[model samples]
Target: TERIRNVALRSKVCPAETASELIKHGDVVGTSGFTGAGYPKEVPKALAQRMEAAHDRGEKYQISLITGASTGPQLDGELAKANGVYFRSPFNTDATMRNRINAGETEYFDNHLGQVAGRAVQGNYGKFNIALVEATAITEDGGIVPTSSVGNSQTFLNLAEKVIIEVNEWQNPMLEGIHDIWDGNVSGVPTRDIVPIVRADQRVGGPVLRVNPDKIAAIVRTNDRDRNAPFAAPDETAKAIAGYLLDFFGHEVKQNRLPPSLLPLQSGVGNVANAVLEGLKEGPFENLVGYSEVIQDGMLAMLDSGRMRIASASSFSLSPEAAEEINNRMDFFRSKIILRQQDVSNSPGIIRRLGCIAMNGMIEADIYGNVNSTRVMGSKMMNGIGGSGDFARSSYLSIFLSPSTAKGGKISAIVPMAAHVDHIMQDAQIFVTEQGLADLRGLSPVQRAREIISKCAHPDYRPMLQDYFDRALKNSFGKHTPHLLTEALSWHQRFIDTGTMLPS
Candidate 1:
């Protein structure tokens, strides 16, 4: 009764009773938040505790857990490790969830946010009977204030029949002004893009619930802050890659296509990507515009220079200094800020139209220019190739930045075939490394091999790459050189060693 009373007081309904009523055996539940923000921690914990207890008593309630993205902290981690099946788009729980995946303890489904949302609306996936969300406030009329960033929370809030809102008092009550919940435009269809247009200063104050107030099973008070782990400093390899990017971009400037002082730009999320951002601070470019995903220390430095007019992103994941600046001067930067959804932000059509230049990290790349950012060795997955394809394929200038060698030089990035391909060769134009830039556009595989080897491959792997090339040329019977299928070689290696492959 106390548990029921507590959930009732917070969510305004008896969730303990309603949860029992709504959640049936083998039901699918979707949670809210992205990485480290907007997660309803309390309700999920209560549900998990109750479910575990029930299971212990020989009662089975096996419900598959789904989330728009992932809520931060150990919430998703804890929930998955409990008696729940975990399915999400992109995972960010570090090694905890990764370990479970490797051990085959969890059933994971990786998909795009749009695909998930489309399915949920159609009730294709298991029925999303309940949605647990966190908010800043609820208006007298009963709208929801999504205090934190609206990653996938809006979709969950819209689709769920039973909505459990956790309203936190600590969030800025004025947050209501910041959010504008507009109807999203379809990708292929031409329509007026209807987006929620909130003022820069309007902190979200309450939920925009279309369903009846009765659907709100409960509202509870809780504190849910974004907790981002500190980013590690760049390694020697990262520094090398950074230096190369700076020089290559400088050369591009010399060509007079890109401006000497380009717009502040956005880098993808990762240590290597961050390292490239850090390198930019010391580079030749100035007055950068960062219209990217997460803003970090490098972007802050650019902002501090007074040259950065707009540093807009959906979220902010920065070092201590950057975080302080953003939080303290929220007003100053908020005006210039534009928070769009993943689909809009990474849309190839939009990115190309805007002439935005994007740089993203690659897990693996083949000689033909196919980049494998999702899976490892073409089988096991890393993070579900977040937004690299979206950016790389569409950007006016795109660079796949990575070290020539990974794992302490034991592995070479220039391989024959990427175990997986996130960005096909046609999509990728440039590949940059400490060695140099591999300009793949307008070049055949043989020509690509010549360029990649001379410019991108590590010095140590050069000879082996050359040897493979020589063998191919010698064994050729026709005008085109025959590739050796016997060896476990990647076309990437030949490209890195010699500028050209054996002509077929």
Candidate 2:
């Protein structure tokens, strides 16, 4: 009751089942979530139940779903099992969800996180029939206080004909003032004013998200926590990768090319990115800033240690321990942490203007510097592009990181040609692995190939890469960017038959 400060609005509160009924078949549902935080828990579960009931009654029911980004199992898993999701967009990480996507049971559109809100605003994806948002509190005047993530909730609320707010009591109530809810006019085509955010600490918006109270169909009361798994500890390979990156940053500082603290840092999600943040804490830099899509536990640790002065992101991807600590220390962390909409957090203009130092993990990178972040063996889908492209194409220093190998060295992270290209060679400014770092700036394609193979490729695969490059140069049709088309993807083909990219 304390969470819902609006006394009169309390009358509209109902059970999740009752709220689920408001959603009909074929409705385009836009829900609040981003990397498993601040997503509606009870309502989505109830909707799955409702769909199952309808299906049992010989009635068809499916809805097109869009979200801030990948959501937890409760939202994506349950619905995917019930076969209630006809179409999904932006991103997903649930196993069942990926199964459906790969099996062609669901129509999934991979999108850049920054473009989701803009496309919705421009009516490119059609109207959002319903906006189901999860919140920590509802202000007396009906402004919504978001919990861990300020995702596309505000944008969905603005566009949807009906709204359902999940007032989750499990969220830290002290998070009321941490969100910088700013909704500017985002368009489909290129046309806009400046984002006006120059620093990570700067705030240009209000704390509460405002929406039309009339469109609110029902408010559901729940106490479910966000579904976030603990990240694994950094491995030896991750440590080496972090070490190489840290040294490169120091070199840039010495060259007078970067500030001592570096630019606003944009670290991607995973153990590798966490290792980099841990490296920063141990290094000499202090008073750093972060401008990225999601703030993970490493970033939170930096904030706690006062290494990072402030961090501005779209959501929190923290472990249970980190979440608990932040809940207890909201007073201290609130001022240092700012959550904004994903579009704003991953905006290209804002990233370029602030010159963010972006570090992202990749599945694989070709010899010529092309990145394949979303595929395996050129056919299967892993996860959507997410916000990496948004940062890599616009940040001042775009760095891609990965271990030299995967699947116990069966697959090399550096391939002759990327099975799928998500980021082109031109956008990839740097590549780092456990071996070393390759600064590809001002380098030709052949130059990039040599540096990447020598500096980033593992010793086990270095001989094969060198042989491929040498042969491709001597016999290939194109000299500008040599590639033997028949042999380019031979490594991946070998993996299928031999279960390894190594020779017999």
Candidate 3:
């Protein structure tokens, strides 16, 4: 039992000890996290709390924070509160951290989950200085076994100069065998033998994460669960949006653009993505498959009925019920699912190669079809740009879905110009709302504006958008992309001035 407590640490010390030495100021630290699970708990929070004093002493204390998807309030919220994160990457969720990114306080790089691993290894996002991973158990030979999500844990361990493995007592010991730890190097993957993985529950990787015991700095044992946020049920509008997408998919099949079963899909997290998958299950599709970042409850439903034949994702962001179901029925799914490193799951190479049908939610879409998944009104952050950019850029059918309005239907999701441009129209194939679906595949900028305004924009905002586009064309600068400099952000300004963007 004492052996379990003292993992492979250079010095079996407290979290503060590890945080103090391993995490230097301005160092790039990548932690093992995905969908708010399996991240180093005490170390990151202790580090943030420690840095608060450093900031008080007029010292610039910040690290380039990186993770698989988002960590939690402890990592993002507290670290950001103390101004400890200089830049964050891949994805995020906490409101406070998002505010820092939006106010131009911190540089946020939106990446495909798959690309983060290889890019970090290539020194693109700075040095992979310190990697803190959470482990359910440590092998007798000083190997690591993961908990709920695999995420970037393997990559973080493989790449980090210094390693800290948090031995979490709260996690079940049985989880030790659940993870198939495939420690493949980025470059070595090409020459390596094919991973003989056909089922979700199959063990392709070694039983434990193989690493030199000398590299372990401090193994901080803590007991905690991930930040499992509750998801709201899909509303009527969400269902309608899903229905529209399903119809489009079916139409594409009918027109021979897609197969009846469709290509391997990638759906981003949120109600819309869930609803769309739900529609697929209830509609005319079966034997579907996924190569996505997070698989939710709806995806679980599809997987059960063989509607989704296989789901290859980075991790699970499912409901509490589905979470229990997966653990209970782990063997049933062993053959149906596979979790990969974030870099592989969100890789541009794989997404483009597979011709993935990417479905993601959006904050807003401009008339010319630029999407803003990050900021509100181009200033305040909602969440980071996330993997929306990665999938949008690489997918064959890059579809964005959202309701036409927000805040009691007062604010239109179809704007004159997005407060931020996370996805340009070139990559986006379809834009869907409960109102209708706009097929933007072959449309030009002005043509995109026409379809977006007529179909996607709410009736309350349609005339305003049309008038803006009309005036912009009239006052054109002959620039390739049309814009009215004066009125480009007028709607956002109007919303700021009054509660609504309705014309006087």
Candidate 4:
């Protein structure tokens, strides 16, 4: 097929089972995937099958699995169900895999997605035994064209002892020229170098990933699609959140704090994030740019509407319709989209240099402006801190958005204190909920607490937050950022004990 243009590499073609044999028990395996895009389809299932067979014979069989981020069922889901995964890293959203992690059956080393590739290459995660990469095409000169995501594929190819390529013919061939793969040297502590990304539309690397041909072990062919659910259309609450954010942006522009076009936008994934993009598409913003981790339908709509000039991201987490559209119109979308490795796409230096407007969804926020994006009620893990930290700590304006209440108003997203803090008050500058938007910049701790409570808290919970702050201010030991330690976590405890954060 035209997918494998390298004649010499065709001799290496083998079955997915054969490739699975190369990864043995206790081996460190790295694969290409991010938000269920561009993951090896066949070999992962084959590996799970092999592991299940071994386990049936009373043989110990498991491997350390590493990836760019969350993968699909064939990878994380299959392995998790087959009891093949012993350790996982970076991030994941698979229900089966998450159950294992939360049950303490699998060791999950959750880290920032942007640092995974750099840290792995620096010998932090130990040696990579094998790399399973999904590619669209292999060039005559041995350059690899990634399918939908330019994730950690190159990093694995550079460091792994052996390489297994799944040249999936299912991927659109036009994806060949959309990727710009590059890596920074991290052999030492400080290299004193820059990432060289000034604008969102600028290209810093080539479209193809190069590797040592000698590392190639097996090439399996398959046809598959990414596994992801279509996001529901933005509801009224999400639109309200988006409206509040848009109004705040307008005010910032009027106050000369932001440009009329705003800065490069860094949006997180989800329905609420999509609502913001929809608002921008219909709002007054023009010629906008995106420096983010994933590209979804809203961004594509904005691009199609001529509101967004260009977008730079690591992966395509699109819905089925948008995914099909991109595949059919790869010629039109190729010039507007630039796919890069996760490290560069979420680079702190690049984010700061471009002054990206970081907008992300959060599980909850405290009255003092701290945020929780990964955990639920302090201990239960929802998802790993993907790239929010990478952008929030480095962007020009870091904004978090969510509904004010969850579980039929039984739980408040705004509380006296966050159950788990992922982004500190210093990193979180602005917050928006269906209630309103609160800009906490240059505010004291007390002022921040007041702003969050008054503007961001839901009507049902606003009085409770106010009462907590008022009592804590007078009764707490410390006046600065006053918190009644004994009562700050009572709400979560109440939920744990009675299944509701609300008082009876």
TM-score of each: 0.82, 0.98, 0.88, 0.98
Candidate 4 positional error at 392, Å: 0.2
The C-alpha lDDT values of all candidates are 0.62, 0.91, 0.78, 0.90
Compose the digit string of candidate 3's lDDT tens values, residues 71-163.
Answer: 888678778888888889878888888878877888887676666776776778876888888887777667777766777777777777888
Cα lDDT, model 3, residue 209: 65
Clashes of 1: 52
lDDT of 2 at 221: 93
Candidate 1 local Cα displacement, residue 86, angstroms: 4.6
lDDT of 2 by residue, 74-183 (tens): 89999999999999998999999999998899998888999898888887677789999999999999999988898888889988999999999888888888899775
What range of 10 consecutive residues in model 4 has the weakest lDDT sum? 183-192
Give each model's clash number. 52, 0, 10, 0
C-alpha RMSD for every candidate = 5.9, 1.3, 3.5, 1.2
Q: Which of the predicted structures, 2 or 3, would earn the higher lDDT when compared with the native?
A: 2
Instruction: Give lDDT tens digits, candidate 1, residues 1-504.
Output: 122222324446444334445556676666666545556666666666766777788987556666645455446665555654444444445455656665676666665543455556566666677777667766555666665455555666666777777676555454444443435542324453533322221322222433466777766666545555577688877888888778878878998868977643658666788788778777767767776655566676667665565665544555555656666766765565554444444445556666777788887666556787776656665666655665676678778888887766657777655667677777788888878888876888778778877888778877676676567667645325335565434543443456333322
TM-score, candidate 1, is: 0.82
TM-score of 4: 0.98
